[PDB]
Amino acid sequence: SVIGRIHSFESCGTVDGPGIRFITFFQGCLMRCLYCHNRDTWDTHGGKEVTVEDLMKEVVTYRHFMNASGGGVTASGGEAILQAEFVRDWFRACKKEGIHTCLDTNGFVRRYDPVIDELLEVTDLVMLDLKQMNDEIHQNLVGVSNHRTLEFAKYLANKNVKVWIRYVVVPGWSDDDDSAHRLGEFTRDMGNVEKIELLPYHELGKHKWVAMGEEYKLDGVKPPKKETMERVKGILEQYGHKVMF
Ligand SMILES: CC[S@@+](C)CC[C@H](N)C(=O)O
Ligand code: SF4
């Protein structure tokens, strides 16, 4: 029945645990972050066609490695939530195999049909990218308003879904102190954020823009100052957050 469109899949040791995570990067994203790591995930009509059956046969070989703490599967890519029906089925097949499931998303949910709730029932962890609390800047950095992502976040809180937050720090855009406080405050109130990951801006994936003959509006911006990272981090910890930077 449901077929999925993916950019790729790779197994990888979870940043902090002995387990391995099988990560499937779903094809397609409606955002256009100036710093996008892989713009090749943008096209919703690209990638490869795979069935739930196909992915599970790829995850099995890694089974022994997923029963270790952070071991499990992750739906990432561009925006995995755009293919919410398939991810639901994938996660359902994984749940019966005794596998931990993580939904890595930007939360750019357009409509709130029941499939989302179904998806969450079989989602052990939601990794939410919060790109910018100041919508003025968010529009300029991403190309869309953060309103939907923000509603989605509140949606997850009211459901008591365990959430980790990811925030990309970029000098001149998200290094602002007023923005760190807005983020720390907002996530504090959600009440379900268990940890925040601070990622310093990186000019990686730039060859994907130039390759497709496109202009990168951040080729002149450099990573954030080691001190600046400590600044925002310290600000977020004031709201009672574990910042795993
Ligand atoms: C840039 C960090 S990645 C682990 C996630 C990139 C983007 N938010 C995505 O989920 O497609
Ligand atoms: S949400 Fe992720 S995949 Fe989509 S444009 Fe932004 S960085 Fe790229």
Side-chain angles (χ1 to χ4, degrees), residues 1-59 61-110 112-161 163-187 189-193 195-196 198-211 213-215 217-218 220-224 226-245:
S1 53
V2 64
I3 287 69
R5 309 198 69 71
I6 71 183
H7 168 77
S8 68
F9 61 65
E10 289 188 62
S11 76
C12 189
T14 308
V15 178
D16 304 62
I20 278 294
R21 281 208 91 89
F22 181 81
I23 313 174
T24 300
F25 298 100
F26 292 82
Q27 183 69 31
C29 184
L30 305 177
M31 287 177 150
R32 299 281 184 275
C33 313
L34 304 176
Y35 57 47
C36 189
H37 275 325
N38 196 309
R39 69 79 56 179
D40 281 72
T41 66
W42 289 359
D43 200 305
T44 69
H45 292 290
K48 170 172 176 50
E49 298 183 69
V50 300
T51 70
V52 178
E53 170 202 61
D54 299 347
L55 285 181
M56 298 307 284
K57 284 162 55 184
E58 288 288 357
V59 64
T61 108
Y62 305 100
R63 189 67 184 92
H64 297 180
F65 293 100
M66 299 179 280
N67 302 88
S69 284
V73 303
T74 293
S76 186
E79 180 56 83
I81 209 140
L82 293 180
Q83 293 181 62
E85 200 200 322
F86 181 87
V87 184
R88 176 199 63 185
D89 292 352
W90 181 31
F91 281 6
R92 272 174 171 178
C94 288
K95 240 73 276 299
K96 69 69 168 54
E97 280 297 346
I99 299 179
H100 187 267
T101 58
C102 170
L103 170 63
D104 191 2
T105 175
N106 304 302
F108 196 56
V109 292
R110 310 288 300 306
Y112 285 82
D113 52 348
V115 60
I116 294 303
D117 286 300
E118 295 185 298
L119 169 58
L120 302 182
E121 297 176 0
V122 296
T123 296
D124 292 310
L125 174 66
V126 172
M127 181 114 79
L128 180 64
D129 283 83
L130 283 185
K131 308 168 177 295
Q132 247 289 352
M133 291 297 91
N134 187 67
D135 200 42
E136 292 174 56
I137 302 309
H138 189 289
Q139 286 169 173
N140 292 94
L141 181 65
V142 186
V144 309
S145 175
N146 57 21
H147 277 57
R148 281 177 177 299
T149 291
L150 256 43
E151 288 299 295
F152 187 62
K154 301 184 178 188
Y155 185 77
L156 299 174
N158 188 284
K159 253 95 297 182
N160 289 83
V161 181
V163 182
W164 281 12
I165 296 283
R166 177 188 296 130
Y167 185 74
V168 174
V169 170
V170 53
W173 295 79
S174 58
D175 64 306
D176 173 347
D177 297 313
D178 176 296
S179 301
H181 282 278
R182 282 176 162 173
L183 176 66
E185 175 177 289
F186 189 70
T187 51
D189 284 59
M190 286 175 68
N192 52 333
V193 177
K195 182 189 73 76
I196 301 183
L198 291 184
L199 186 159
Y201 159 73
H202 261 176
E203 185 184 292
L204 195 168
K206 174 171 173 289
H207 46 288
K208 307 188 195 309
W209 277 71
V210 58
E214 291 178 358
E215 185 50 59
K217 300 194 193 68
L218 292 180
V221 182
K222 67 188 177 187
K226 171 63 181 182
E227 281 178 343
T228 302
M229 285 299 268
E230 307 289 36
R231 170 73 282 184
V232 56
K233 175 172 179 175
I235 290 183
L236 295 172
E237 299 178 314
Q238 284 175 292
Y239 291 92
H241 304 304
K242 165 69 283 188
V243 179
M244 194 171 278
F245 165 55

